Design a protein around this nucleic acid. Structure first.
Ligand SMILES: Nc1ncnc2c1ncn2[C@@H]1O[C@H](COP(=O)(O)OP(=O)(O)NP(=O)(O)O)[C@@H](O)[C@H]1O
Lengths: 602, 553, 181, 92
DNA sequence: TTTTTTTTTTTTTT
C-alpha cells in the first residue's frame, strides 16, 4: 500500500506538475469545482499518457484496484487546495473520459473483462435512485468495541474481529455517510450489430454526480469497466461499473436547460430572425430528401417550436403544439418525411403502431410479479412528453387508449385510475398523424370523412389536417424524377445541398439546437387585430361550411379549429423569436391551413 | 551567384526605414519548401525588427498580375520557388531603372535547369544558386561570353559555326528535364548558421522543409540526415532528464516509418492507407488484405489491436514493435520502411515525427476552408494557405489536429478512389509512357488541387509501378468537375524502389511546352509548375494525339 | 465614452501600469536616447548590472541586446519562506513585490531564458501561492462589512480582478445601513 | 461484398425516359405506379450489377432493369395495353 | 437455521 502510496504521490505529482501552457488545467479545475461542490474532476487520459505512460500501463491493467487510490490522493489534493489547516470534506468522485477507441456491444465477451471499454449504445429505462454506503461505524452486540469501516468502491461483508462471534456488528445508521447509485439499463444502438437477432441490454451503474445525468431513451456514451457479480456455474451477472459517462451530442438539454451559452448562438439565432428566408430556409432544412410538397413541408416546422401554451387561472390550459395529418396516397414521402421529423426532435419516440415498437401507445401499468405491487411501466407518449409524436398505421391504433390519444393531445394529460394509482400524468406531446387513408384515392369520390375509423371527430382533435394528392402529372415529376437519380448515386443531390450550406441552408443538427433554444424562452403572442382577423376569416370559414353544407352534406370545422389555427400563429411567430406577431405574419399561417379548408371542400 | 552573408548584409542596407521598407517576400507558392523557409526567414526579419509585407501568390501569371499591380517605392525584393526557368526581366521588363539600381530582387528555388538569364546579366538578381550549383555549368560561361558580343565570308560561316557550336551546346541546356535539387530551407539554415544562429525550432523547420519532399526522391535528402542528425548532435538539450520537462521537451531520432499517420492513427489503417504498403503488398487486393492479416499472424497482434488507437496499444507492443517488425516484415519485402529520422516532442501534447507532421500541412492546402470563379477559387486555396502558416506555429497545436484528422479524410477519399480506378483498369500502356484520365467520380473539386492529384498520382505511380517490372514509365493524370472543362492535368515520374541510380529528369516540362509551342488551343500555362496545366476536353484529346507524337522521351 | 470597464482597470491596462516600474538588466551594447522620463543614459556598459524601466528592457530583450535580471525576490528557496509564512499566518497575506503576478507572466513570456530553473517550478509555487492567498482572500470575504476594509497586502492584479464585487456590493451594504436612520 | 453504383452521366436518361414511362401511364388507367416505382428501377439494375460484379453500374445493367419494368407494367394493363405496347417501344 | 406467493394486467386467438 506504500507502493500504492508511491502511486498516490505519483498522482499528486500528476496534478501539481502538469501543464498545457501555462495553467495547470486540473488544478484550476479543482478550486473551480470545490465552490461548485462538484467534488469531482474529468481528466483526459491523453494528458495522462502525455504525463507518464507507466502509471497508465498499470492503470489500464487493474484499474479497479487503483481508481479509488487515484481518488484518495486527489481528495487529499483538495486538502492542499480548498483550505489551510493548523471540514467536513467529502470523498471525491472522479469521472474520466477519453477519445479512446469505440467497441461494439455484441462482441463484448470475456477477454476485455475487468478493463476500460468506450462504447455508446442507448439507454432504455432509468432505475430509481438507490442510495449506498460511504462511511459506516459499528458497536459490538457483545464487547461494545467501536469499529469504523470506510466503505469504498468498487460484495464485502462486515468484518468480525474485536464469542465475540460470529460477526457481532450492526450499522450505526445515525453516523454514516452516503451516495446515490443509478442502475442504468441500457441498450445497444439500433443500427449495429443486430445481425438477425434482437438488441441486447447490458446493465451498468452510476453513482454520485454521475446520477440522473442521462434521460431515459437518449443516445449516450459510457466508458466504465466490464465486470460481473452473482445476483441470484458459477454464472454471475455481467455488468459495467461507470466511469466516466459522457453524453452523445449534445445531449445536454435537460434540464431548464443549457446553452451554455457560447454567445455566437444568440447572434446566429437573431440573424436567422433577420433572414427573411429563415422560415422558408427551415422549410429547406426539413427535406434534403424530399423535393416538393412544400405545403406540408412548411407545416412540419411550426409544430416543433411549440405553439401558444397559456395557463390562465383557473386551471384551464390550452395545448401546444397541435396536430397534423399526412394521410394521402402512398408515394407521399410521409414515412420518409416522418423519419426525418423524429430525428429532428430533440427528444421524441417514433411510433408506427399499434405502438412503438413494442410500446403500449399509452403507459400500461403492470405488476412486478416479484414482490407484487403494480408499478407504472412507462409509455411511448409518456416518455415523449415535451417532444414529438410520431404515428404511422393510425388506421390501426389501439382503440381503447386511442381515446387516451383523443385526450392526451388535448388535455395534455393521461388519467390512469387503474389498479392503485390515480395520478394524471403529463403528455404535452404534439401529434403528427401519418396514417394511410382508407382505399387510397377512393375516399376522394366518396365522403372524405369517416375516413379515420368510424368518427369524423378525430379530425377536430387534430388541427393542420392535410390530404396529399399526387396525380401522375407531367414535369412536376420530370424535375423530381430528375432529382431522384441525383439523390441516389453519387449523392449528386446531396452534394448540391452542401453549397447551399455555405450559401444559405441550415445544418439541421443545428435545427435541433434552434428548436431546443427557442422553445425554452417564454411563449410568443399575437397583437389583437390578427385575432379579430381570425374572427372575420373564420366567421366565413364556418359560414362557408354551413353554406357548403346547404347540400345537406355530412362532415371538419369546430371552435377548436379556429383555436388550432391560433396556435399555428404563435408557432410561426416563435420562429421569429418575437413576443409579438404581425398581421401578415399570422396570414401565411392562415394560407397554410387554408389548404385544409379545401380538404373540407373536397 | 554570391555567398549569403554578402546579399544578406546588403539587403540590410536597404532594409530599415519608416514607413517601411521597402522590400517584401513573395511566398511561392503552395509548394511547402518555401513555408518553413519563409517562416524561419520571417523570424529572421522579425529578429532584426524589419517590416515586411507577406504575399502568398498562386498563379504563374498572377505573379505578373502582382508585380505590375502594386510596387512603388520598393527598394528591394524577395521571391521564392520561381524563375528557375523563365526570366522576369523578359516577363516584367525591366528595362534599366536608375548601376546600383533602385530596386533589388531576391529569388529562391531548387528547380533546374536555371534560366540562362539567371547567373549572368545581373539586373533583377542577385542569383541565389550559391553554393549548391557552381556548377560548372561552364556552358553558360560560353553561353554569353562566347555568344557576346558575336576572308570575311569564310570566317562568317566560321564565326556562325562556332556560334552554332555554342548554339548546339547552349541548346541542350535549357532544353532538358526539370528537377528539384535541395530544400531551400537548409540553404537558409546554413545561412542562419553562417550568421551563427541555430534554433531547435529552425532545425525542426529544416526538418519539415527537407522532409517536405521525402515522398519525392531525396536525393541529397539521403545525405541530409547527416546534414541534420549532426546538428541534432549539435543540440544537446540536456545531459539527462530533467523529466519531462513540461517545456523543452525537444526532438530526437527514432524508428520512423513510411507507413502513414502512425502516431495519431490505428496501426491497421496505418499499414492500410500507407503508400509503401500499397503496391508492394497489393492493398486494392483482398488477397493482400488477408495476406496483411498474416503479418499480424506473425506479429502476434489482434485484429482488434490493429483497430486500436496508437495511444492505447500496450507498452509491450510498443517496445517490441520494432523488433517484431525485424522478425517479420523482412518476409514480404518490407524491410525498407524503417528509418531513423526525426521526431518533435511537445511531450504532454504528444510527440510527432517530422514525416507525419508534414501531411496535415498538405491537408490545409485543398481543404479546411466566368474565369473569375476559378480565380476566386485559387484565391480560396491561397486563403487556406495561411491556416497552414499558423499550422506551422506551435502556439496553437489544436488547429493543426484539424488537418491531422483531415489526412484520414483525404486518404480515405484517395485510397478508395485509386482502387476504384484499379478494378476499372483505366490504365493505357500506350508505348512511350503509361497514361490515364478521370472523367468523373466523387469529390472532383477535391481533385482541383494540384496536390491532390500530385499525392494521388504519386500514390498511383507507386501503385501502378513498384516496379512491377519492367521499364518504369512516366505518367499523366486529368480531371474535371466545373469551369466548362479546365481538365486539371499533371506530369509525373517513376520512383525507384529505394535502390535511385539516376536523377531521371522529367521531360514533360519541355514536352508540354512543345504542345504550348504547338497549336496550343485552350492550353493554359497559368500554372506555376511546368508539370501541370489547364486543358479543354475539346482540345485535350487532340492534345493527347499531339502528346503521343512527337514523343520527346 | 469608455463604456468598459469602467471604474475598475483592465488587467490589460494594469499591466501597462506595472510596465512603468524600474528593474536591473545586463546590456549587450556599449543619440542619446533623449526620451522624456528616462534620464539615463550615456552608452551603457555591456555585461554589467544597470537600472532601467521595464518596457524598454522588454523591447531590447526582444532585440536581445540586453538581458533582464531576475528580481532577487523571485527564487524557489525564497518563495518557500514566503509561502511558509503564509501557512503559519492564516489572516495576514505576508509580503510581496506587489506587481508580481504581472511580472511573472511578463518575464516568463520572454525573459524565461535568463532565470535558472523557473520552469515547472515557480509557476507551480506561485500557482499555489496565489492559491492559499486566494483562499485567504475568499475566507476574509465573510468579514465583509460597512464600512471598514483591511486588505493589507494584496496585489493590484489580485485586487483589481475582483474589484467590482466588493466595491459594488459594499455600496449596497453601507447605503442601506446608514439609510436605516 | 459487391456494392454497385451508377454514374449520373448516362443516368439522366432514365429521368427523361421515366418521363416517357409515366406521361402516358396517364393514357390508360391508374396507377399502379408511384415515385417509389421509379425509385425501384435503380434497385433492379444494381442487382444485375451485383451479378456482373461490376462494382458499379454499366449502362446495359440498366437496360436489364428498365426492360423488366416495362412489361412488368405492360401486360399488367388491360387489353387496352394493345396501345400501351406501341408507346414503350423506344424504351426497349 | 429456515421460514413464504394467486389477481390483474395485458395478450393473441377462435
Ligand atoms: N420527394 C419525394 N417525393 C416522393 N417520393 C420520394 C421522394 N423522395 C424519395 N421518394 C421515394 O418515394 C418514397 C416516398 O415514401 P412513400 O412512397 O410515400 O411511402 P410512405 O407513404 O411515406 N410510407 P406509408 O406512411 O406507410 O404510406 C420513398 O420510398 C423514396 O424511395
Amino acid at each position: 500500500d506504500d507502493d500504492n502510496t508511491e502511486i498516490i504521490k505519483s498522482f499528486k505529482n500528476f496534478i501539481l506538475e502538469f501543464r498545457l501552457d501555462s495553467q495547470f488545467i486540473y488544478r484550476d479545475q479543482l478550486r473551480n469545482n470545490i465552490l461548485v461542490k462538484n467534488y469531482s474532476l474529468t481528466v483526459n487520459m491523453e494528458h495522462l499518457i502525455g504525463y507518464n505512460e507507466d502509471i497508465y500501463k498499470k492503470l489500464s491493467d487493474e484499474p479497479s484496484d487503483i481508481i479509488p487510490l487515484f481518488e484518495t490522493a486527489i481528495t487529499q489534493v483538495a486538502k492542499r487546495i480548498s483550505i489551510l489547516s493548523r471540514n467536513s470534506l467529502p470523498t471525491f468522485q472522479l469521472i474520466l473520459n477519453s477519445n479512446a477507441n469505440q467497441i461494439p456491444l455484441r462482441d463484448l465477451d470475456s477477454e476485455h473483462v475487468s478493463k476500460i471499454v468506450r462504447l455508446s449504445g442507448i439507454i432504455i429505462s432509468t432505475s430509481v435512485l438507490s442510495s449506498r454506503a460511504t462511511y459506516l461505524s459499528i458497536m459490538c452486540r457483545n464487547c461494545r468495541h467501536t469499529t469504523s469501516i470506510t466503505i469504498n468502491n468498487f460484495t464485502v461483508s462486515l468484518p468480525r474481529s474485536c464469542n465475540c462471534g460470529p460477526d457481532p456488528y450492526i450499522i450505526i445508521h445515525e453516523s454514516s455517510k452516503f451516495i446515490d447509485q443509478q442502475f442504468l439499463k441500457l441498450q445497444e444502438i439500433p443500427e449495429l450489430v443486430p445481425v438477425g437477432e434482437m438488441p441486447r441490454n447490458l446493465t451498468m451503474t452510476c453513482d454520485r454526480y454521475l446520477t440522473n445525468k442521462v434521460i431515459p431513451g437518449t443516445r449516450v456514451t459510457i466508458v466504465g469497466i466490464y465486470s460481473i457479480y452473482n445476483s441470484k456455474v458459477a454464472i454471475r451477472t455481467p455488468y459495467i461499473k461507470i466511469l466516466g459517462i459522457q453524453s452523445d451530442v449534445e445531449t445536454s438539454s435537460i434540464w431548464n436547460s443549457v446553452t451554455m451559452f457560447t454567445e455566437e448562438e444568440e447572434e446566429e439565432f437573431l440573424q436567422l430572425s433577420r433572414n427573411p428566408k429563415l422560415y422558408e430556409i427551415l422549410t429547406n432544412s426539413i427535406a434534403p430528401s424530399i423535393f416538393g410538397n412544400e405545403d406540408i413541408k412548411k407545416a412540419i416546422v411550426c409544430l416543433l417550436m411549440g405553439g401558444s401554451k397559456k395557463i390562465l387561472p383557473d386551471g384551464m390550459r390550452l395545448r401546444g403544439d397541435i396536430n397534423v395529418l399526412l394521410l394521402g396516397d402512398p408515394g407521399t414521402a410521409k414515412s420518409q418525411l416522418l423519419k426525418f421529423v423524429e430525428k429532428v426532435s430533440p427528444i421524441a419516440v417514433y411510433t408506427s403502431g399499434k405502438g412503438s415498437s413494442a410500446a403500449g401507445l399509452t403507459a400500461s401499468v403492470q405488476r412486478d410479479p416479484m414482490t407484487r405491487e403494480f408499478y407504472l411501466e412507462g409509455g411511448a407518449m409518456v416518455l415523449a412528453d415535451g417532444g414529438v409524436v410520431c404515428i404511422d398505421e393510425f388506421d390501426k391504433m389501439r382503440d381503447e387508449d386511442r381515446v387516451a390519444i383523443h385526450e392526451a393531445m388535448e388535455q395534455q394529460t393521461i388519467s390512469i385510475a387503474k389498479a392503485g394509482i390515480t395520478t394524471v400524468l403529463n403528455s404535452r406531446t404534439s401529434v403528427l398523424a401519418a396514417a394511410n387513408p382508407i382505399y387510397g384515392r377512393y375516399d376522394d369520390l366518396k365522403s372524405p370523412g369517416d375516413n379515420i375509423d368510424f368518427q369524423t371527430t378525430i379530425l377536430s382533435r387534430f388541427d393542420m389536417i392535410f390530404i396529399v394528392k399526387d396525380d401522375h402529372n407531367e414535369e412536376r415529376d420530370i424535375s423530381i424524377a430528375n432529382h431522384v437519380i441525383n439523390i441516389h448515386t453519387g449523392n449528386a443531390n446531396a452534394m448540391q445541398n452542401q453549397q447551399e450550406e455555405n450559401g444559405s441552408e441550415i445544418s439541421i443538427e443545428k435545427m435541433k439546437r434552434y428548436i431546443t433554444y427557442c422553445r425554452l424562452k417564454c411563449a410568443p403572442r399575437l397583437s389583437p387585430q390578427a385575432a379579430e382577423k381570425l374572427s372575420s376569416n373564420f366567421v366565413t370559414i364556418r359560414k362557408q361550411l354551413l353554406i357548403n353544407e346547404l347540400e345537406s352534406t355530412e362532415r371538419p370545422i369546430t371552435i377548436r379549429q379556429l383555436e388550432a389555427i391560433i396556435r399555428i400563429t404563435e408557432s410561426l411567430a416563435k420562429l421569429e423569436l418575437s413576443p409579438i406577431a404581425q398581421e401578415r405574419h399570422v396570414d401565411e399561417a392562415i394560407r397554410l391551413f387554408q389548404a385544409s379548408t379545401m380538404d373540407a371542400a373536397s | 551567384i554570391s555567398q549569403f552573408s554578402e546579399a544578406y548584409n546588403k539587403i540590410l542596407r536597404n532594409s530599415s526605414s519608416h514607413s517601411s521598407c521597402q522590400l517584401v517576400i513573395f511566398v511561392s507558392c503552395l509548394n511547402i519548401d518555401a513555408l518553413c523557409a519563409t517562416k524561419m526567414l520571417s523570424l529572421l526579419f522579425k529578429k532584426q525588427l524589419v517590416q515586411s509585407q507577406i504575399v502568398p501568390i498562386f498563379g504563374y501569371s498572377e505573379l505578373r498580375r502582382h508585380y505590375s499591380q502594386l510596387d512603388d517605392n520598393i527598394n528591394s525584393l524577395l521571391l521564392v520557388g520561381f524563375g528557375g526557368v523563365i526570366d522576369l526581366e523578359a516577363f516584367l521588363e525591366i528595362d534599366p531603372q536608375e548601376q546600383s539600381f533602385r530596386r533589388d530582387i531576391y529569388v529562391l528555388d531548387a528547380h533546374r535547369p536555371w534560366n540562362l538569364d539567371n547567373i549572368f546579366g545581373s539586373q533583377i538578381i542577385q542569383c541565389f544558386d550559391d553554393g549548391t550549383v557552381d556548377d560548372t555549368l561552364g556552358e553558360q560561361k560560353e553561353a554569353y561570353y562566347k555568344l557576346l558580343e558575336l576572308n570575311d565570308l569564310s570566317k562568317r560561316k566560321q564565326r556562325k559555326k562556332q556560334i552554332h557550336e555554342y548554339e548546339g551546346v547552349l541548346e541542350e541546356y535549357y532544353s532538358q528535364g526539370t528537377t528539384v535539387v535541395n530544400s531551400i530551407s537548409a540553404q537558409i539554415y546554413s545561412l542562419l548558421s553562417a550568421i551563427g544562429e541555430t534554433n531547435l525550432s529552425n532545425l525542426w523547420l529544416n526538418i519539415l522543409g527537407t522532409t517536405s519532399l521525402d515522398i519525392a526522391y531525396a536525393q541529397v535528402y539521403n545525405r541530409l540526415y547527416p546534414l541534420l542528425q549532426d546538428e541534432v548532435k549539435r543540440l544537446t538539450p540536456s545531459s539527462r532528464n530533467s523529466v519531462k520537462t513540461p517545456d523543452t521537451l525537444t526532438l530526437n531520432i527514432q524508428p520512423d516509418y513510411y507507413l502513414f499517420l502512425l502516431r495519431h492513427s490505428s496501426l491497421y489503417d496505418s499499414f492500410y492507407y500507407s503508400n509503401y504498403v500499397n503496391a508492394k503488398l497489393s492493398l486494392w487486393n483482398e488477397n493482400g488484405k488477408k495476406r496483411l492479416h498474416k503479418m499480424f499472424a506473425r506479429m502476434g497482434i489482434p485484429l482488434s489491436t490493429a483497430q486500436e488507437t496508437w495511444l492505447y496499444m500496450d507498452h509491450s507492443i510498443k517496445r517490441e514493435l520494432g523488433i517484431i517488425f525485424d522478425k517479420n516484415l523482412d518476409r514480404y519485402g518490407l524491410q525498407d520502411i524503417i528509418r531513423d529520422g526525426f521526431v518533435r516532442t511537445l511531450g504532454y501534447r504528444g510527440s510527432i515525427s517530422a514525416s507525419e507532421f508534414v501531411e496535415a500541412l498538405t491537408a490545409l492546402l485543398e481543404v479546411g476552408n466566368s474565369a473569375q470563379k476559378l480565380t476566386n477559387l485559387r484565391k480560396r486555396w491561397v486563403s487556406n494557405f495561411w491556416l497552414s502558416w499558423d499550422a506551422l506555429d506551435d502556439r496553437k497545436v489544436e488547429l493543426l489536429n484539424r488537418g491531422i484528422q483531415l489526412a484520414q479524410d483525404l486518404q480515405r477519399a484517395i485510397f478508395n478512389t485509386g482502387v476504384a480506378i484499379l478494378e476499372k483498369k483505366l490504365i493505357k500502356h500506350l508505348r512511350i509512357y503509361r497514361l490515364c484520365v478521370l472523367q468523373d467520380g466523387p469529390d472532383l473539386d477535391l481533385y482541383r488541387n494540384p496536390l491532390t492529384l500530385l499525392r494521388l498520382g504519386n500514390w498511383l505511380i507507386e501503385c501502378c509501378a513498384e516496379s512491377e517490372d519492367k521499364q518504369l514509365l512516366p505518367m499523366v493524370l486529368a480531371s474535371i468537375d466545373e469551369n466548362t472543362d479546365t481538365y486539371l492535368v499533371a506530369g509525373l515520374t517513376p520512383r525507384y524502389p529505394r535502390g535511385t541510380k539516376k536523377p531521371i529528369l522529367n521531360n514533360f516540362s519541355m514536352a508540354f511546352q512543345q504542345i504550348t509551342a504547338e497549336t496550343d488551343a485552350k492550353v493554359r500555362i497559368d500554372n506555376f509548375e511546368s508539370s501541370i496545366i489547364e486543358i479543354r476536353r475539346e482540345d485535350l484529346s487532340p492534345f493527347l494525339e499531339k502528346l503521343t507524337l512527337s514523343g520527346l522521351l | 465614452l469608455p463604456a468598459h470597464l469602467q471604474q475598475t482597470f483592465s488587467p490589460e491596462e494594469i499591466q501597462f501600469i506595472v510596465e512603468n516600474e524600474p528593474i536591473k538588466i545586463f546590456p549587450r551594447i556599449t543619440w542619446q536616447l533623449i526620451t522624456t522620463d528616462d534620464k539615463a543614459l550615456n552608452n551603457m556598459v555591456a555585461m554589467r548590472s544597470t537600472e532601467v524601466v521595464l518596457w524598454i528592457a522588454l523591447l531590447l530583450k526582444q532585440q536581445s541586446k540586453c538581458s533582464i535580471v531576475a528580481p532577487q525576490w523571485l527564487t524557489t528557496k525564497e518563495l518557500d519562506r514566503k509561502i511558509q509564512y503564509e501557512k503559519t499566518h492564516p489572516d495576514r497575506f505576508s509580503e510581496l513585490p506587489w506587481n508580481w503576478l504581472v511580472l511573472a507572466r511578463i518575464l516568463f513570456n520572454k525573459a524565461k531564458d535568463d532565470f535558472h530553473d523557473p520552469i515547472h517550478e515557480l509557476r507551480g509555487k506561485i500557482q499555489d501561492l496565489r492559491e492559499i492567498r486566494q483562499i485567504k482572500v475568499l475566507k476574509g470575504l465573510k468579514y465583509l462589512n460597512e464600512s471598514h476594509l483591511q486588505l493589507d497586502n494584496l496585489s493590484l492584479l489580485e485586487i483589481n480582478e475582483l474589484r467590482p464585487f466588493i466595491t459594488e456590493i459594499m455600496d449596497k451594504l453601507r447605503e442601506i445601513h446608514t439609510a436605516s436612520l | 461484398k459487391i456494392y454497385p453504383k451508377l454514374h449520373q452521366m448516362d443516368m439522366d436518361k432514365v429521368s427523361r425516359v421515366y418521363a416517357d414511362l409515366r406521361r402516358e401511364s396517364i393514357s390508360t388507367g391508374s396507377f399502379p405506379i408511384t415515385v417509389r416505382h421509379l425509385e425501384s428501377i435503380l434497385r433492379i439494375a444494381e442487382s444485375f450489377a451485383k451479378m456482373r460484379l461490376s462494382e458499379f453500374v454499366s449502362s446495359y445493367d440498366l437496360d436489364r432493369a428498365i426492360k423488366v419494368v416495362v412489361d412488368s407494367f405492360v401486360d399488367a394493363q388491360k387489353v387496352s395495353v394493345r396501345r400501351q405496347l406501341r408507346r414503350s417501344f423506344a424504351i426497349y
